[PDB]
Structures are given as structure tokens and as C-alpha cells.
Design a protein around this ligand. Structure first.
Ligand code: FDE
Ligand code: FDE
Ligand code: FDE
Ligand code: FDE
Lengths: 455, 451, 453, 454
């Protein structure tokens, strides 16, 4: 039963790297999975990793005693500006435990009720923008969602106002970040790491990290003086670690600011953009979700309890994140020598990559309609098998903002369904842009206001 | 000293799932385009390297470093072709023995003797088309298999297959086609002892008995009551040993010449005729030369040699779709290929002829265009760039025979008929181990020229 | 072994002041005449070496040691041509990808399909000149851009620019010349980030949006129904034989820009120069009109007839020899090497082939390099390798080389069949430089030979 | 992340220099590198340099367009008697290119075939010395390796016989040379170089230069009264500069003799002593290497082709030089302003130090057994990353005698294995002497003759 592993086409000494010379490597890795099956080895000069696609092996890989979160080659490149932050640190690094234990209070159900007022602030700015568009104008979905998601993490997390809705081009922070993340991804597919074309890029990459830092330094200075708040930033500057009694390193706080601004708005914006794309393509689920939102949101502004009662909006959001997980992959390594699936041996340190979009299209778990957008699959949250739905990672290195994300998207998805009717006037054909995360590109809509007031 | 590209592997099956199609040669071409001039191809128990460039092929065609290898494909046809000229190792007792006995039959001097018999078959083909009614059409590769099988029969063994007296194919042809398909299907077969293939084994033996049944028929018909290729098989003595051929090898040599001596020629004329009806200016230029040179009721031996543009058409056809699409080599001694690839003694190479003939560095960016005028001066062409007939001492013994036949027949077709591609035929290339267009059909308007 | 010559230096600005003219290529041609076959040219951050002799150019055209480079000029054009065929590095994914799918659009078989569309544009030019009143004259480079732009539009994208229905140039060409001239003027700027160039940056971006508003017009008019078999079909539907994929939406956008520009701008300059040499060299003009009268026996010329205008092509070859409308191409050193056995080069060092200077090497062409003698091109086989390089070199040579010559012959053939041309002004040749070359203010008068169409 | 650079404890106006107030600085900087990571700045009165330890940054520093070889304060002190010779000259100095192009012919694998005969001479003297020991005696490894490596460079390079095996104390040349090298290192720590404490050392340094020059005069004169030869010394006197036609300065020619006598024997003996240390400590690799040696060395004297065929022998030598690179460091500076690792900016001219033993101890490259001597690391030589194994420097200023050194070390180590079994009768505990190179100190073994004739 110990069998050898499939492997895609190899190009001499470059091994499989030429296959990653595309603008959409994750959809390219998905296509490789369909041709090679549940698992295949991917070799590049110096690196070797195995890609997992079935719950059968992914449930086995998620045993935290045998496998631990690995920094994929992608995360090492994101680490050049996020450093030893919660996302790009090793589990055994002193700043992971230290930072994890200090910042977890900020995402407790106790913390969420304080954030709700501020999330409604930005949510009203987006509705107010859409109510003030003229009849001929349209809406750029991912651009207005990035306005909303970035402004939200700034106000709830750091009491800093990017004021993105007063900008008609993207915010200067997001442009440098987007280019830095695109650089991170292109460094993966990069053959010569000194070729004449790639010398300028480190000039631009250096310029783009400085712009991002000139902002976090602006956040720290804007706090130093201008006060009274118990934010995520308050725990960062003042929180001591219960296990060691220490506050965060000065260098770590700046690395943490970068982490939460990036990881805390980039993937949520894709989620909302994908979620809204699926609704506009399935008008029965859209009308059913629009009448739940009409039912629960009876005040001019939504309350915290009302958001938790949008069960169908939550099922819509989950079915969206099932098909296109905006954080599309996470990695593990082999703590010790072991056999995976009783067929594949691993030496200690071997790297595994979870393909969340491939896992979420496993026929063995989801059935025949895996490519259909059926929010009705999430009426049985308990009936869903173990390790079959993992858009938020696994285990102790899972996404800390999972409840924060769900609350923000539901609130915002709720008010849009309550306040607008949406037309797919272009018959948008889905084109999924890939930085390291996923979002629909050039997706546009028109929104007829139902002229329901705010406050 | 570079590492070699390799297509997707499927664990213990390696690359074998990739050639699990009915058309393996065209699949290796699509892999050559993705992986380049050379790639490794592993199947359980076998490993071979496929070459695509003149640069590397010119080194593989070096007779001191590489020798003819029996690819896995030829090892399977050896179940009925045995140690005949095609399926023998060069060092086998029967190779040079048969080679030395049979080569006299392909001199430009036996060829003149064959011409009368080629015209016989060639006139039967014209007459079949001239007797078609107005709505009828021609199944091209089927009528070509009629002609070439009859021709190697009459010239080689003084035996009449009478293929034009048959509406269905000839029973020998049916068994030969099934055996060649089995040989090709065995290459891609995962578990070969599975019950799915049990009928195939009993049919494969039934088809060998049929081919041998006709070989008994051919030999007895000669014991009954010439100086042809069969006279030499029975009567020739090898100058090196003074002994004639074993009766077991004789049967294998007849099988070889009946197969290799009509299957590739039938595909060739069908491809040549395909490109002509697809390129009407080349067709008028060729039909004008046949009108010019062929002034008698039947063409003479000298006149065929004067069909120079017709010969260029045939050469340009066989460049694009060489009907024997590959030949195999092994290493013989440890060597380095092209200065980057080390090879151990015995390692196997396969020449992908359709790919070599598509080398833009040799033929230009119009490699897929049908321009017979590239062969206005064949001596200008690099060596080892055009290999439709193999290489070296194991090259095709009958290429002067084929070219003479293909010219003779193509010349008379262009002289006596106008050809309409009345169906807008879309090229579909069927693979046994050889290549042919499959459903290729046309209509033929007779020029009402007597014979 | 020999130090390399360099012209006068100006402090920290190095040689940059020397090209602060409207005609930088003609200024470099002059520097080459004093400094010889190769000289080094320094700018504040960059260094380049200019080659002028066939002796050194044959080595630069050696692809094992040198590959195509993006000069500072092309790096600036890459700001609106992007990843297109012209401004891509050969080691970029999109080059080989776009080359393999678009190369078929220029195979001889396609020329026969384009030929009908090419004739459409040319007939419009003939009848435009036939409808001029007696006192009026002809602006040569102005009507030639009308023709080549409309031709690449019809042959490439099935899009009608309708330039002959236009006042002054089309908005694309009007916007493109500013974008190309901005690119040329950025080469003289000591410090670009200076505030004085904000009007220039604003105007440069405003012109980029205009050109894209037209590629978007072309794409939208196509996917609104679509069985054409043109170059744009291959951009949208063809898949790359090596990778199995088709082109990016982003890249198809970059190639449309690429082909509209380089595919009419150098052709228009070519034809204007040929007509200059014809009206200035009345012996060659009569021989060219006597052949055109001979071969063009039909109301419209056929593909077969244009391929037989041998002397007309020889004029075109001698025109582009003297004034290659794309005046230079750039190369860099794959790895450390010695050029000419005399000058060592580090890996990546930049070379520039000065094409008008290469074509004036008296050691190759003889002592009459300035004479317009079409008969050097009678048996092209005598021409030494790498002495006549108007279309670039190697795998990065001009892709539309056959497309252009055929278009140029067809139009030049018909003008000569239908007209005698008077150089009524004694035009003194003035070479305007965008990044390409064209004669500026060339005018002629044309008396119709009154032959119908 | 455009970071600030770590730096060990500072001591006011002495900066970080007090931390290098040891007789073994490289192992002390190794101790700091392990504590501070891939890079740290090191300040002394007037000097500052940044030390690199990871292949990640060393891959960037070995880029010849961005960084060029620098003469560290250590090499500037060796310049006091080696001058403008190949080792202590700047790349942009006129003599470097000149002397480099004329002497590079002397290290051609065709020139190697000429040396094989002469290298065998000295190597035979080593075996015969050990075959003539009485039973109780033992072998002092680094003294006999230096006896051999010096004899090899003298006979092969200059046709001069030190006859180091016909003496039982070190050669008069070697003692002053070693004192000159120790002096150069010790100047790197002086809180004030004009204190009277150093006055004897300043006279000894001049005394040691005069003796080395007194021998350099003997090697040129003994050739004056001969021809002939076509050795390394012939190329120095007669070789013309290919670009300018000038021969070497007779004041440069002397510096070049000094250079090759030092660099061409000092690191080779340290290598052989280390290689022999690891064999005698890893007894099964010793048996695997002796079997290969018995198999390949079938004649009384070894041939050139046979040395190239001692494939495992080369693997042992390589793992030796990986663990303890006998030239432990080389220095670089910043041609132009650039950013190192995308985190550390550098001004033009700022200096870097590549710490070879730490580079050869990177877990990212060699795995989790980086401290174990597994010669099987060097079987697929292409499987080693680039700029991961740099015992011979980098680029155009890499060690010119690389193929020369390996041919000696392989040849001599081959004959030792063929003719002797080695007993580590003391369980020697490794103590690393540091001049400017590395050698094991007091390393001793006893050798039983395998009684194979010569
Ligand atoms: C704020 C925020 C928000 C959010 C959201 C989200 C969404 C929508 C999606 C997601 C996801 C995710 N995440 Fe998320 N998020 C966040 C966050 C985070 C953090 C901090 C992290 C890391 C943690 C630790 O490790 O400690 C994550 C995390 C995460 C993950 C995992 C990673 C790995 O590699 O393992 C995933 C898959 N996230 N996410
Ligand atoms: C009778 C006849 C006819 C013919 C034809 C032909 C055509 C059309 C084409 C061809 C081909 C060929 N061939 Fe050919 N053919 C023949 C034959 C033959 C023989 C017998 C052989 C074998 C030779 C030897 O080896 O000896 C051949 C052979 C041949 C070849 C080779 C193969 C290998 O394996 O190497 C080729 C490629 N073929 N071919
Ligand atoms: C369409 C068209 C038309 C044309 C024309 C022309 C004329 C008249 C002239 C010319 C030219 C040229 N081109 Fe030219 N053309 C074109 C195009 C093109 C393209 C696409 C290109 C790119 C190629 C590559 O590969 O890169 C070119 C290209 C070209 C060139 C090259 C550039 C470099 O830098 O190398 C040259 C020199 N063209 N050209
Ligand atoms: C004879 C000889 C021998 C030898 C050996 C040796 C061994 C065993 C080791 C070694 C090493 C070395 N080297 Fe050595 N070696 C030599 C040498 C030399 C010289 C001359 C030099 C300098 C070069 C140039 O730079 O030019 C060296 C060099 C050398 C080096 C470098 C230094 C720097 O700064 O970079 C090193 C690291 N080496 N090595």
C-alpha cells in the first residue's frame, strides 16, 4: 500500500517551477489537482511540497500532534514587511505565543459588541455613497468593498481613519500593499533572481515597504498623543503576556500593525465581492436573502443582536467562502517521520499545502452539486463532517478574526440587501485576480435604491 | 550537462497514462511542443528519450555511437514479423544474411523490371474510378490500400490479391490491421493479464493464423510453377556463409514485405492526395507536369523519372506526415549527447520524425505550409534534417521502390481525372503503428482520356 | 587594448547635453562620423556604446553572446506599450507566448487575405488625389499615415479608422505622436521628478487614456459578433502550442497598441522617403513608373502582380537603407565578452546599433554611400551578412517585415501607375524625429494619368 | 522591514574591540554570530565592518557587480611584507590584473600534470619518514604537514629545496613567517600601537621581514646560476603583461614569491591536519577511504590519472574544509550605495566580512546534522547550492591554487591511507590554533606501517 506520488511536468533543472509562471497560480494548481488527483508532489530548485485536495488526507494532515503550521515559500516573502507578526511567525517563536495571548481578548464575543458601533459607521458611509450615485453610474464592487474593509480595520483596530470613501482612487496604503503582495507572489514564479528585468523591482519593493511603514508610524504617533481607548492597539502597546509578563517588542508592534491591516481587510473584501457575485447570479437565493434582511433589520441602523439573526445571510456567506476561499491555501510540515494515508511516507520536516478550493469541491463530502451555489447546504452546521470546511485554517494557528469577519460581512451584506436592488447589467464573466488572496476583478453592478432611510 | 524534461508522472505508472489514447504519435508531438527538443518517457520497466531537433538527431544518426534498437512497439509486432528485416537487431544472425540476400531486388535495375507490373495495378485503379457513376465518390485510403497491397503482391511474389475484385477489404488486410492495432494497444496497457483483454489475445492469434494461412498459400503457389524477391528468398545463398534462408525466417520475410511494403506507401499517396486537393495551385502545377510528360497510353520508366514536380509533391507530403513516424536507437557505448545529456550503454532514444521535420531552424517559419518547391534542390538541404526513410545501414531498403510507385500512380491520377474535395474533408489521422488519413473521400471527374 | 572614444563631457551631466536637440539620432550620426566605429556615451545613471560598422555589428548580432535589450527609449514606450511584442524582454513569458500565436497571422497565406483589404485603403488614396483641384498640392507624410493606419486597422482588427474622411490626423495618431515625442524628450531631462514636468506628466497620461479608449472600442466591437480570421482572432482565441494557454486580457490590450503604432508609423515614414527619392531622382522615377505601367494591367492589382514589381521593391530597399524609419535597436551582453577583440564588455553592458550609420559603411557598400542607387539590390545575394539590417535581428527581428513590404509595394506601385509627381517646392529634406523618422513638410503636386480604377 | 543591525556589547571609545581581545577571534566571532544571527556590525577605533554568516546574505555579497574584495585591517597589516602581491592587492591596482593574467597559466590542469612528479617526491619523503620511526614514537601531524606543504610549494613553484624533512625543528623561514602572521593578527587588538609594550614586537617584526627577504634573495639567485625550468618562477621573470607588455616589477616579483610561499603551504597543511583529524575520529570513514585507496593506488608510485580517481578521498577532504575552512574569512566593500537583504542599507565603501565557518554551518542548506562529518554530502557535487560552499573565496579573486591544493591534499592523503593504519592513542581533544589561518594544535597520532613497499 506504500505508493509513490504523482508529479506534474518537469523542466529539467527548474523542476516544476515553470508551471507557476502565471498570473493565477492557485487556479493553475487546482487544474493540476484535477489531472493528478488528491495529492501530488511539486518540486522547485531547493523546495519540495505536496499539495492536498481530499478531506481524507486533509483531515489526517490537520492532526496538530503530527503536523504544524509551515511558512510556505509565499509567507517567507510576505514576512519581509510583516516580519514576526501573528501571521508569518513560526508557532515556536517567542513572539507568537506572546502576541497570541496578548491580542486574543480583542476578538472575544465581549470585544465584538464594542466594535459593532464602529462597523456600522463605515457601513453607513458605503450605503450613503451608493444612495448618492446618479442613475447612469455603476458600482465597482471590489473597490468599494476594499474602501469599506480597510476603513473598518483602521477604526475598530487602531482608531485611525483612512477616510477611503473621500478618495476616488484607491488609498495610497493599499496600492503599495497590493504591489508588495503581487511582488511576493511573482518572486515565487521567478527563475533568475538577479536577471536584468528584476533589479528595478527591488527599488519599487523597497519604496512600497517604506510607504506602508510611514503609515504605521503615523498610527503610533497619532496615538502617542491624541486618547482613552481599549483597542486592539491598546493591548498591543500595553498588554503584558500572562505566561511571561512582558509587553511586545517595539519592532513586533510595527510588524503587528502591518499584519492586521493587511490580513484583516484584504480577505474580507474578496469574501464580500465573491458573496455578492454569487447572489447576483442566483436570483432566488438573492430574493430569499433580501427578504430575511428585510425581516430582521427593522431599525434605521442594525443592532448587534439583529446581525446574529441573519441565519440565511450567514449561510450565503459560508457558501461563498466555500467555493472561493479568499485565503486559498495554508501549509503544514511533518513534525516527525510518519505515513500519510497509510500509503505516503514523510520524513521529518516535509511540507504540505492544503488546497482549500480543492478540498471544498470534494465529491466524497459535498456530493454532486459541488460547483452549484446552494446556501442550503449550511442549514446543518453539525452535519458537516470534520475537517471538510477549512477556510479559516486549522487548529491553534487558525484565523483569529473569524468571528470578526463573519460579523462584519453579515452586517454589511445585510444592509446592502435591505437598502438596494442589484442588476448584473454587464453579464459579468467571473475573472478571479490573484495577489496571494483572491477577489473578483473588474466586477461591476448597478444598484437601485429601495429608498429605505438610515441614521 | 543538463537535466532532461519529463511530462506528468502518475506514480508507479510513470508517463504511461499519458499515451493512453488511440493516437500515440500525435500525442508525443503535443508533448514535444510543451517540453522541447528532448524529453524522458518512463513506463514501468522501460525508459526512452524522445528527440525532436536536427541538432540532436544528427548526433543520434552517428553510426559509430548509436545502433538500431527495437522499441517496445517493434518488439510486439515481432510476434508475427519475427526476425525479418524490419524487426531484427543489426547483430542478429538473420539480419545481414537476409539483407545480403534481398538487396539485389531493390537496385535501379530490378526496378525497371517492376515497372510493367506497377502499370498493371495502376491501370486497374484508373479503370475503377473511370467506371464510377456520377454521384459516386472515392474512399481514398481504401483504394490506395487496394493498389499498394496488390503491387507488392505482384512484383514481390507474382501473386494476385485482386483487391479491385473485392468491395470489402481483403481478409489478410483485416487481420494485419487488427494485429498492428493490438501491437500499438499493448504499449499503453496497464495490467495486461486482466480479463478485459482475454478476447484480444484469442483474436490476436486468430489474426496471425490468417496471415500465416496466406503465406502458406503464397509459397505453395510458387512451388507449383521467375526472378523476383521471392525467388531470392528461396534460392539466394548468403555470400558470407554460403547457406540459404531458414524456412521459418522466409515466412517472416514475406510477412514483413507484405506489411512494410504497402502500408506506408498507401498512407503516403493518401497524404499527397490530401494536400493536393487542399492546395489547388500546387495541384494545377502538378497536373500540368503529368499532362506534359505522360504522352503515351501507359507511362514508361523514363517518363516517371521526369515527373520532377510530382516527386517534389511526394517529398513534401512525406515530410509533413511521414507514414512510418519513428525509429529507435540505443547507445552501444557510454556517450554524451549534444554536450549536455549523458547516456549509458544501452539507453534508448526515439526519433520523432514528424517533429524533426517541423524544426523552424531548418525549414523556416512556414514549416506547416505545403510548399513542394523547398525540394527544388535537395542537395542544399542539411544532412539528417529529412529522415522519412530511417538512417544508415538500417534505413528503408525499398525507398527507391516506393518513390517510383508513388510517382507513377500519382502521375496517372493527375493526368486522367479532376479531383473535387466535395465533402470539405477535415484531416483525421488514424494510427495503427503507421499513419493514415481515415475518412478521406473525394469525387473524380474523368478527363475522358483513353488508356 | 584600445580605450573607447567618448565625445565632449559636461561635468556631472556626462554627455547628456550633446543630444539636447530635436534630432538626436542625426546628432549621433554626426558623433559617429568624428569618433568612428564605436564610442561610449555616458549619461548620469546610464552608459551605452554605439556601433556603426558592419565589423562590430556582426558580433552584436551573435545571439549566443548578445540578446535584445530595452534601450531607455523603449523602457519609456513600455509605459504605454506594456508587455507587447516590441517592448518585452525575450526572457519574459509573454514574448514567446505572443510570438507563437501571432506569427501565423503573417504567414504568406494570410497576405493573400489581407491583400483585398490593403487594396481598399489604397483605392481611397488614389481617388483622394484624383479629386484634388488643380492649384492644390499633396502633403506626403500626412496622406501616408492616413493609408498605413487605416491598413493596419482593416487588416488587423476589421476596424475602419476612416482617416481619409478626416480634417487633420485621427485622435489616436494625434495622441500617439505626443506620447512618442514625450518619450523622446524624457531622454534629455537631467532630473525628471522636477516640478516643471507636471504639465508633461499630466499630458502624457491623458494621451495614454485616449489610445486605450480606442483599443477598448476595437475589443467591444469584435466580441459583439464573430467569425473573422484576422490577427485579433488569434489574440483572443488562439492557444500557445508550448503552454496551451491564450493571452491575458491585459496583454491583448498591450498588443493592440503595439501593432497600431509600430505597424503604421515606420511604414508611413518608409513610403514618404521613397517618394522623396523618386521626385529627387528623376531617372529612377521613370523606370519605376514604366514597370508599374507594365505590370498593373488590371483595374486593381492582384497579389501575384505586386509580388512581381521587382524594381519598385528595390527602390523601397534603397530608401529604407538610407533612412531606416526605425533608426536603431539595442542589444546587451548575455555574459562577459570582448567586442571586436579590442573592447572588453561585462555581462549586461548595453550596445546600440546605429542603423543609418551601418548602412553608410563605405567598406561594404562602396564609396557612393549617399547615392540613391536602387541597383545595389538587383541580386541581393551579394549583400554581406549583417550589412543591411533595417528590420532588426534574429528572433527579435521585425515580425511584420513581409507585411510591410507588400503593403509598401502595392501603394507605391499604384501611385506610379496613376501619376506623375512634381517636386514643385524643391523640398529640402528635413527629418523630423519622433522616436521614428519621417520627412517633415514634404509636399508634391500630382498630375493624374487619368487611368480608371 | 528595513532594519537596524545588531551589534555586540560596546566599550566606549574602544567600541567592540575588547570582545576580540582573545588569541582565537574567529571562534569568538563564530560565538557572536550564533548569538546575534546572520549579520552584526563590529566597531574598533577607526574601523567598522559587518560580519555575514548566512548563505542568504552571502549570496548577495558574492555578486561581483555590487561588491568587490576589500583588504581588511588584517590584510593591510600583511601588506607590510607582502605588498602588492596577488593576495594583498586591490583589484583595481595596476599589478593585480597584470600578475593575475601572467600567473594563471601556472595553474592549468596541463601544468598540474607537470607538478605530479614533484609533488610525489615530497610525498614519498613523508611516508619514508613515518616508515623509519621506531615503535614508541608518534607523529606530530601539523608540523609534518607543514614540512610537506612547504616543501611542495618550494620545489613545484621555485625549484628550491627547503629540505624541511632534513631538520627536526621548524625551518628558519617558517618560524619568522609564523611570527609575522601572528603579529598581524595581534595588531588588530592593540588599544594603542605605540605603547612600549610593543617595541620588541616591532623590532621582531622587522627582524622577521629581513629573514624572509634573506631567503627570497636565495631563491632568485639560485635560479640566476641555472636556467633550466618552466616553473612558476619562470613566468614571474619572463612573462609579459598581455595588455601592456611590461614584465613584473622586480619589487613586485619579490612580493609574489613571499605570497606563494605563505598562501601555498599554510592553508594546505591546516587542511591535511584537519582531514587527518576527522578520519582518526570517525573510524569507519577511515576504513572506507583506505579501501578506496588500496583499490586505486595499485603501483609503488601514484599516477596523475589515479589521483583524479580517488573520488571518496576528495569527499573526505571537502567535508574537512567545510567544517574548518583553513582560510576562515574574506572581506568585501560596497562599490556603490545598495541595500543588503532588503533590510540593511550600505554607503559606498562600507566593508563586509564573510565568516566562512558559519556559512558552512547553515541549517537551511546542510540540514540538521551540520556538525557531523558525513563525507557523503559531496557525492552529487551539483546538489550543493551556489555560494553555500566557499572555502576558496569568490569570483575573480578566488583562490588561484584551488585545483593545485586539492591535487596535493588528495595525493598525500592517498599515500597515508595506503601505507598506514592510524591509531589516535591520545583521544585527542581538538584545539584550534589561529594565526591568520586555522590549524589543529598539538594534534598527534601513532602510525602502524601496513608494510607496503615503494
Ligand atoms: C483580522 C483578520 C481578519 C481575518 C479574516 C479572514 C478571512 C475572510 C479568511 C481568512 C483566513 C485565514 N486566516 Fe484570517 N483574518 C484575520 C486575521 C488573521 C490572523 C492574525 C491570522 C494568523 C493567526 C495566527 O496564526 O496566530 C490569520 C490566519 C488565517 C488562516 C491560516 C493561515 C495559515 O497559513 O495557517 C486562513 C486560512 N488570520 N481570514
Ligand atoms: C518494401 C518496402 C517499402 C517500404 C516503404 C517505406 C515508406 C513509404 C516509408 C518507409 C519507411 C521506413 N522503412 Fe521502409 N519500405 C519497405 C521496406 C523496408 C524494410 C524491409 C525495412 C527494414 C530495413 C532493414 O532494417 O534492413 C524498412 C525500414 C524502414 C524504416 C526504419 C525503421 C526503423 O525501425 O529504423 C523507416 C522509417 N523498410 N518505408
Ligand atoms: C506590424 C509591423 C509593421 C512593421 C514594420 C517595420 C518597418 C517598416 C521597419 C520596422 C522595423 C523594426 N521592427 Fe517592425 N513592424 C511591425 C511590427 C513589429 C513588431 C510586433 C515587432 C516586435 C518584434 C519582436 O519580436 O520584438 C517589430 C520589431 C522591429 C524591429 C526590432 C526592434 C528591436 O529593438 O530589436 C525593427 C528594427 N516590428 N518594422
Ligand atoms: C598557492 C595557493 C594554494 C592555496 C590554497 C588555499 C586553501 C586550501 C584554502 C584557500 C583559500 C583562499 N585563498 Fe588560496 N591558495 C593559494 C593561493 C592564493 C593566491 C595567490 C590568492 C590570491 C588570489 C588573488 O586574489 O589574485 C589566494 C586567495 C584565497 C582566498 C581569498 C582571500 C580573499 O580575500 O578573498 C581564500 C578564502 N590563494 N587557499
Amino acid at each position: 500500500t506504500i505508493k509513490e506520488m504523482p508529479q506534474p511536468k518537469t523542466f529539467g533543472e527548474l523542476k516544476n517551477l515553470p508551471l507557476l509562471n502565471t498570473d493565477k497560480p492557485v487556479q493553475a494548481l487546482m487544474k493540476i489537482a484535477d489531472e493528478l488527483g488528491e495529492i501530488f508532489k511539486f518540486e522547485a530548485p531547493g523546495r519540495v511540497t505536496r499539495y492536498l485536495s481530499s478531506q481524507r488526507l486533509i483531515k489526517e494532515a490537520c492532526d496538530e500532534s503530527r503536523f504544524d503550521k509551515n511558512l510556505s515559500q509565499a509567507l517567507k516573502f510576505v514576512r519581509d514587511f510583516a516580519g514576526d507578526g501573528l501571521f508569518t511567525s513560526w508557532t515556536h517563536e517567542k513572539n507568537w505565543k506572546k502576541a497570541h495571548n496578548i491580542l486574543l481578548p480583542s476578538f472575544s464575543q465581549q470585544a465584538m459588541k464594542g466594535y459593532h458601533a464602529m462597523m456600522v459607521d463605515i457601513a453607513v458611509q458605503l450605503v450613503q455613497k451608493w444612495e448618492r450615485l446618479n442613475a447612469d453610474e455603476h458600482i465597482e464592487v471590489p473597490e468599494d468593498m476594499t474602501r469599506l474593509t480597510l476603513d473598518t480595520i483602521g477604526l475598530c483596530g487602531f482608531n485611525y481613519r483612512f477616510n477611503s470613501f473621500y478618495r476616488d482612487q484607491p488609498h495610497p496604503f493599499i496600492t503599495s500593499m497590493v504591489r508588495a503582495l503581487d511582488e511576493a507572489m511573482n518572486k515565487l514564479q521567478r527563475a533568475n533572481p538577479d536577471d536584468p528585468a528584476y533589479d528595478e523591482n527591488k527599488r519599487q519593493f523597497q519604496e512600497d515597504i517604506k510607504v506602508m511603514n510611514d503609515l504605521v508610524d503615523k498610527i503610533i504617533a497619532d496615538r502617542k498623543a491624541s486618547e482613552q481607548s481599549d483597542d486592539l492597539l491598546t493591548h498591543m502597546l500595553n498588554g503584558k503576556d500572562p505566561e511571561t509578563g512582558e509587553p511586545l517588542d517595539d519592532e513586533n508592534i510595527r510588524y503587528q500593525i502591518i499584519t492586521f491591516l493587511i490580513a484583516g481587510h484584504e480577505t474580507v473584501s474578496g469574501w464580500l465581492s465573491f458573496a455578492l457575485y454569487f447572489l447576483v447570479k442566483n436570483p432566488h437565493v438573492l430574493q430569499k436573502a433580501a427578504e430575511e434582511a428585510a425581516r430582521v433589520l427593522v431599525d434605521p441602523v442594525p443592532s448587534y443582536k439583529q446581525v446574529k439573526q441573519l441565519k440565511y445571510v450567514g449561510m450565503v456567506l459560508n457558501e461563498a467562502i466555500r467555493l472561493w476561499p479568499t485565503a486559498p491555501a495554508f501549509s503544514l510540515y511533518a513534525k516527525e517521520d510518519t505515513v500519510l494515508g497509510g500509503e505516503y511516507p514523510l520524513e521529518k520536516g516535509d511540507e504540505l499545502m492544503v488546497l482549500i478550493p480543492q478540498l471544498h469541491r470534494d465529491k466524497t463530502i459535498w456530493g454532486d452539486d459541488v460547483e452549484e451555489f446552494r446556501p442550503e447546504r449550511f442549514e446543518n452546521p453539525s452535519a458537516i463532517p470534520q475537517h471538510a470546511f477549512k477556510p479559516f485554517g486549522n487548529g491553534q494557528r487558525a484565523c483569529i478574526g473569524q468571528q470578526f469577519s463573519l460579523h462584519e460581512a453579515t452586517l454589511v451584506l445585510g444592509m446592502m440587501l435591505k437598502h438596494f436592488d442589484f442588476e448584473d447589467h454587464t453579464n459579468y464573466e467571473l475573472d478571479i485576480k490573484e495577489t496571494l488572496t483572491l477577489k473578483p476583478e473588474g466586477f461591476v453592478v448597478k444598484a437601485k435604491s429601495k429608498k429605505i432611510p438610515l441614521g
